[PDB]
């Protein structure tokens, strides 16, 4: 159910006689037997986990924390990454560009893995048949196949009904439209081609 491969990493526990086992989102280029260094003083190499305060501008990172210690929430999908834009030492905040293109300000103590997520280019391949989508979503959730609203009867969809197949009213709906009425293009600022 996840495009990106995962990496099992074994650490030595700081203060206990045992092994600390972790599961990281794999960055492209990492291999079995590689040494990973996590910390403020870790070197700037792909696969290392560093605080954003120690990552110079223009760096490509992945699995970026939103709150210090949350252990990573941003740019985790295959082939995705965030870009470090600038630092603000006055308030200790770093600016990042997310995969969607949005610019976000996070505390400079937030951690991030150097490099991009492995498995990029997955969505380029055409699937060519319904069976491939069936297999894809079987391990994700019951969200496939999808029945069009205009193919239903009125009782179960606002788009249902009619002697012809058609919506019959604007497919753009209100942001505050109640559940059951909020279908189609929700709160669309525009429609159609660019």
């Amino acid at each position: 159910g996840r495009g990106a491969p995962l990496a099992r990493v074994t650490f030595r526990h700081p203060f206990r006689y045992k092994h600390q086992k972790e599961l990281f989102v794999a960055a492209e280029g990492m291999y079995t037997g590689q040494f990973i260094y996590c910390g403020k003083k870790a070197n700037l190499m792909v696969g290392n986990v560093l605080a954003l305060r120690s990552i110079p501008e223009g760096a490509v990172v992945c699995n970026v924390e939103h709150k210090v210690g949350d252990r990573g929430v941003f740019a985790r999908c295959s082939g995705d990454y965030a870009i470090v834009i600038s630092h603000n030492p006055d308030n200790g905040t770093t600016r990042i560009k997310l995969p969607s293109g949005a610019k976000k300000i996070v505390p400079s103590g937030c951690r991030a893995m150097i490099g991009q997520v492995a498995g990029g280019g997955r969505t380029e391949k055409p699937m060519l048949k319904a069976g491939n989508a069936y297999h894809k979503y079987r391990v994700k959730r019951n969200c496939w196949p999808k029945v069009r609203g205009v193919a239903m009867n009125p009782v179960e969809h606002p788009h249902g009904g009619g002697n012809h197949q058609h919506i019959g009213h604007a497919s753009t709906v209100r942001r505050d439209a109640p559940p059951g009425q909020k279908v189609g293009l929700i709160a669309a600022r525009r429609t159609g081609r660019l």
């Binding site: 492209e28 990029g120 280019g121």
Partner: protein, 91 residues
């Protein structure tokens, strides 16, 4: 004998899905099933185990790479950028 004029690997799909889609998927079909050079042991024995995972049959090293290729184009650019930044920090 030249079994197929131009279909090659996508000949398994017969006459389905359209010529454009068959040609488009030919690239992935060839790349994900081709062998790749292993930098750790110098052998052309790297094969895809699953999307993004590439294992070498000779030395046993497993790497995380592209979905259908061992190394994506952006991977080299990211490595170059990281190396430049690391050199700037270290100097």
């Amino acid at each position: 004998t030249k079994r197929t004029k131009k279909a090659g690997i996508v000949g398994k799909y017969g006459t389905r899905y359209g010529a454009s889609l068959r040609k488009q998927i030919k690239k992935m079909e060839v790349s994900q099933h081709s062998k790749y050079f292993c930098e750790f042991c110098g052998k052309y024995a790297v094969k895809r185990k699953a999307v993004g995972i590439w294992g070498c049959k000779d030395c046993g090293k497993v790497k995380a790479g592209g979905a259908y290729t061992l190394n994506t184009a952006s991977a080299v650019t990211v490595r170059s950028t990281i190396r430049r930044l690391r050199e700037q920090t270290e100097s």
